[PDB]
Design an enzyme around this catalytic site. Sequence first.
Site, PDB file in Angstrom:
ATOM      1  N   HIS A 314       0.826  -1.199   0.000  1.00 16.25           N
ATOM      2  CA  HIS A 314       0.000   0.000   0.000  1.00 16.25           C
ATOM      3  C   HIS A 314       0.867   1.257   0.000  1.00 16.25           C
ATOM      4  CE1 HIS A 314      -3.954   1.937   0.742  1.00 16.25           C
ATOM      5  NE2 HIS A 314      -3.171   2.897   1.199  1.00 16.25           N
ATOM      6  N   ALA A 315       0.615   2.140  -0.969  1.00 15.39           N
ATOM      7  CA  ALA A 315       1.489   3.283  -1.202  1.00 15.39           C
ATOM      8  C   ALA A 315       1.559   4.194   0.018  1.00 15.39           C
ATOM      9  CB  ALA A 315       0.991   4.079  -2.411  1.00 15.39           C
ATOM     10  N   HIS A 344      -0.060  11.972  -5.567  1.00 18.68           N
ATOM     11  CA  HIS A 344      -0.521  12.054  -4.187  1.00 18.68           C
ATOM     12  C   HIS A 344       0.644  11.883  -3.222  1.00 18.68           C
ATOM     13  CE1 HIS A 344      -3.305  11.504  -0.782  1.00 18.68           C
ATOM     14  NE2 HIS A 344      -2.429  10.598  -0.382  1.00 18.68           N
ATOM     15  N   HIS A 348       2.910  14.495  -0.343  1.00 14.53           N
ATOM     16  CA  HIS A 348       3.374  14.284   1.024  1.00 14.53           C
ATOM     17  C   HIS A 348       4.858  14.615   1.148  1.00 14.53           C
ATOM     18  CE1 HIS A 348      -0.321  12.615   2.565  1.00 14.53           C
ATOM     19  NE2 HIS A 348      -0.286  11.530   1.807  1.00 14.53           N
ATOM     20  N   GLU A 372      -3.047  15.484   2.853  1.00  8.11           N
ATOM     21  CA  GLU A 372      -3.592  14.638   1.802  1.00  8.11           C
ATOM     22  C   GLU A 372      -3.930  15.405   0.534  1.00  8.11           C
ATOM     23  OE1 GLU A 372      -3.360  11.588   2.165  1.00  8.11           O
ATOM     24  OE2 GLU A 372      -2.924  11.634   4.325  1.00  8.11           O
ATOM     25  N   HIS A 474      -6.791   0.920   5.887  1.00  4.90           N
ATOM     26  CA  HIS A 474      -6.649   1.865   6.988  1.00  4.90           C
ATOM     27  C   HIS A 474      -7.219   1.347   8.293  1.00  4.90           C
ATOM     28  CE1 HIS A 474      -6.284   3.881   3.214  1.00  4.90           C
ATOM     29  NE2 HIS A 474      -5.713   4.912   3.809  1.00  4.90           N
TER      30      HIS A 474
HETATM   31  C1  8JV Z   1      -5.456   7.203  -7.060  1.00  2.74           C
HETATM   32  C2  8JV Z   1      -5.409   7.397  -5.543  1.00  2.74           C
HETATM   33  C3  8JV Z   1      -4.973   8.600  -5.002  1.00  2.74           C
HETATM   34  C4  8JV Z   1      -4.933   8.761  -3.625  1.00  2.74           C
HETATM   35  C5  8JV Z   1      -5.329   7.722  -2.782  1.00  2.74           C
HETATM   36  C6  8JV Z   1      -5.274   7.926  -1.392  1.00  2.74           C
HETATM   37  C7  8JV Z   1      -6.595   8.754  -1.032  1.00  2.74           C
HETATM   38  C8  8JV Z   1      -7.516   7.777  -0.784  1.00  2.74           C
HETATM   39  C9  8JV Z   1      -6.686   6.625   0.041  1.00  2.74           C
HETATM   40  C10 8JV Z   1      -7.214   5.207  -0.180  1.00  2.74           C
HETATM   41  O1  8JV Z   1      -6.722   4.478  -1.075  1.00  2.74           O
HETATM   42  O2  8JV Z   1      -8.129   4.730   0.548  1.00  2.74           O
HETATM   43  N1  8JV Z   1      -5.425   6.787  -0.367  1.00  2.74           N
HETATM   44  C11 8JV Z   1      -4.311   6.016   0.173  1.00  2.74           C
HETATM   45  O3  8JV Z   1      -4.566   5.186   0.969  1.00  2.74           O
HETATM   46  C12 8JV Z   1      -2.870   6.262  -0.275  1.00  2.74           C
HETATM   47  N2  8JV Z   1      -1.921   5.726   0.730  1.00  2.74           N
HETATM   48  C13 8JV Z   1      -2.062   6.408   2.009  1.00  2.74           C
HETATM   49  C14 8JV Z   1      -1.092   5.793   3.039  1.00  2.74           C
HETATM   50  C15 8JV Z   1      -1.289   6.426   4.445  1.00  2.74           C
HETATM   51  C16 8JV Z   1      -0.473   5.786   5.603  1.00  2.74           C
HETATM   52  C17 8JV Z   1      -0.355   6.477   6.798  1.00  2.74           C
HETATM   53  C18 8JV Z   1       0.361   5.934   7.855  1.00  2.74           C
HETATM   54  C19 8JV Z   1       0.958   4.693   7.715  1.00  2.74           C
HETATM   55  C20 8JV Z   1       0.842   3.999   6.524  1.00  2.74           C
HETATM   56  C21 8JV Z   1       0.125   4.541   5.465  1.00  2.74           C
HETATM   57  C22 8JV Z   1      -1.720   7.889   1.875  1.00  2.74           C
HETATM   58  O4  8JV Z   1      -0.688   8.244   1.242  1.00  2.74           O
HETATM   59  O5  8JV Z   1      -2.463   8.774   2.395  1.00  2.74           O
HETATM   60  C23 8JV Z   1      -5.762   6.529  -3.321  1.00  2.74           C
HETATM   61  C24 8JV Z   1      -5.799   6.370  -4.697  1.00  2.74           C
HETATM   62 ZN    ZN Z   2      -1.941  10.462   1.558  1.00  2.00          ZN
END
Ligand code: 8JV
Ligand code: ZN
Length: 578
Positions: A314-315, A344, A348, A372, A474
């Site tokens: 997970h990114a 995205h 960060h 975000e 999440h």
């Molecule tokens: C095309 C696109 C664009 C953006 C997303 C983002 C928004 C929706 C949400 C989701 O997919 O539901 N989303 C992520 O989840 C991304 N990844 C987390 C990781 C956050 C994190 C915090 C602490 C520890 C580990 C990870 C983060 O960058 O915000 C999704 C898809």
């Molecule tokens: Zn994010």
Amino acid sequence: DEAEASKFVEEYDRTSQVVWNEYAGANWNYNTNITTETSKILLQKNMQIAQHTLKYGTQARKFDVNQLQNTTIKRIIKKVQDLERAALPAQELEEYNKILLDMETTYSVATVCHPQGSCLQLEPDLTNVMATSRKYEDLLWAWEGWRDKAGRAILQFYPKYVELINQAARLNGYVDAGDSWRSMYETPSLEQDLERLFQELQPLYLNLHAYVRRALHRHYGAQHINLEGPIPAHLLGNMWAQTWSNIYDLVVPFPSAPSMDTTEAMLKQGWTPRRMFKEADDFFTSLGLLPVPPEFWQKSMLEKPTDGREVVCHASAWDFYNGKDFRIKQCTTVNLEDLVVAHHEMGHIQYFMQYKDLPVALREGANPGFHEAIGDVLALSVSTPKHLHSLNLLSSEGGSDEHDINFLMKMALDKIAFIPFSYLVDQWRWRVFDGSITKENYNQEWWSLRLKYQGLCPPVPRTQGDFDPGAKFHIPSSVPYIRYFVSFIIQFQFHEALCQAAGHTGPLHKCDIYQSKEAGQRLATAMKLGFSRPWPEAMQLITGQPQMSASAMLSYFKPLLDWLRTENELHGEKLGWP
Ligand SMILES: Cc1ccc([C@H]2CC[C@@H](C(=O)O)N2C(=O)CN[C@@H](CCc2ccccc2)C(=O)O)cc1
Ligand SMILES: [Zn+2]
Ligand SMILES: *[C@@H]1O[C@H](CO[C@@H]2O[C@@H](C)[C@@H](O)[C@@H](O)[C@@H]2O)[C@@H](O[C@@H]2O[C@H](CO)[C@@H](O[C@@H]3O[C@H](CO)[C@@H](O)[C@H](O[C@H]4O[C@H](CO)[C@@H](O)[C@H](O)[C@@H]4O)[C@@H]3O)[C@H](O)[C@H]2NC(C)=O)[C@H](O)[C@H]1NC(C)=O
Ligand SMILES: *[C@@H]1O[C@H](CO)[C@@H](O)[C@H](O)[C@H]1NC(C)=O
Ligand SMILES: [Cl-]
Ligand SMILES: [Cl-]
């Protein structure tokens, strides 16, 4: 007195940088190499950072912040008084850290297997099935199988997780963990404010929902789609039905105005994960913002390893708290969706670099939604047909009303469809944390909200033992979600403001801020504030006013709302799901 408090925050900042840098390193090593050994080191580092947190949090609580004059020192000390999990007794702390690691490991290594067949991982395999399969039964297999394997396996952990995260919250002065999460916005009216914004987006969502429901009825058949009911949750191109753009092919407003296949265009032209992140880096520097350091390219994990390692795919974007070492960990696939993800995540990183000279206690976004929103704002411009054509990923689509509505529909399938999903995730979790939802009805109340807010139903009736929230990253990773709702509202406010600063005229959705130094300067000034000031000040620096407002998103999509009302009217749609 004032002098002791100033010295204290200086000492906190120096020691925190060292300890947090060590923790981030061990956390990275596990996330990019899941093994027994890296897990053991991480759990050890958890106790080390907790020792630090307890030492300085205990000292911080001996300051009466009421008596302190300097507001910044007041702000830092008040924050350091919150020990988070380090407030737990040692036994409970060890248990909590193990539960968190077990939950995130379970989610990240879960697979769905065919009998006497191959086993599929979530990324890329099941993600690709949900995005491209148009067979009801194949989509159902992936949708149900993922919940059976990932969701059900998290249920054994979740009640104890809730008990312990709530216990920690109460030991830090909150009523429960949801209360502590909401406090990150420093906005007592948060729940009412978000409800008002959600209600303002209802005309758009309800019309988009009815139009997509009609298109699904056309494709999957009248026996499988109730034109006055909720949509089956496995048909929207995405494992969680949180964004719907992968079913654009089923819902194209004007099929006589076809769009280039962007995935095949990226592959044919030799795009790679590195190229995708280089393009994002270029967009940021075109605004006069900061390039990522050379170290980023050496240390980041921008594609899924092939050397056998198991990883958290997970990114995510990583700050190592030394002002120099920033990294992304993404199992990048070459397609347009992951190009948006890359932007995205690079947003960060940009925020990390902009506030790197603040004391670490203030190295956060103005509120979590701001963190975000940055990358998404740039991705709004990246996504315009103008910019995509310049990347040779679309043909010339300008000067065509049909192409225009098509593009707005493509954007709505992601941006509008996500509004109810991003609202409901923490509506559910806040009620779990406050005890309104117990383990007796975790899943029933989840689907009550999926129905109430998104107008979706499960394609297979749920049974005791199902824990479908556990199948969403999440939840087992204990990452708050309302930030994404806030982000989707304010990113359009930012887009509108930056487009005005760049001198754009005409419809908001035609704006592309590429190379606008005026736009970059707005973002930079706000990001440099970090968490040093209440977020309305950063809102003011970007937009010229201090509130969250849906008006910018509504303005962006106004032409589509008009088209959807006309289209739904002439087909006789009954909006909603009575
Ligand atoms: C095309 C696109 C664009 C953006 C997303 C983002 C928004 C929706 C949400 C989701 O997919 O539901 N989303 C992520 O989840 C991304 N990844 C987390 C990781 C956050 C994190 C915090 C602490 C520890 C580990 C990870 C983060 O960058 O915000 C999704 C898809
Ligand atoms: Zn994010
Ligand atoms: C309340 O306290 C905060 C924080 O103080 C800082 O932390 C304490 C723990 C302690 O260590 C203090 O000694 C320390 O300053 C105060 O906020 C800081 O205020 C100073 C001065 O206004 C800022 O200093 C700036 O630092 C920049 C570093 O990148 C520097 O570039 C700036 O220079 C600019 O201005 C000069 C003016 O001539 C110009 O010549 C330069 O070319 C450049 O434009 C500037 O020196 C800190 O950044 C602030 N820190 C934070 C975290 O906000 C605050 O002032 C104080 N409140 C009151 C009322 O005194
Ligand atoms: C993965 O972790 C193990 C144990 O810590 C280590 O020996 C190994 O070198 C790591 N692999 C990579 C590719 O970093
Ligand atoms: Cl679900
Ligand atoms: Cl949040």
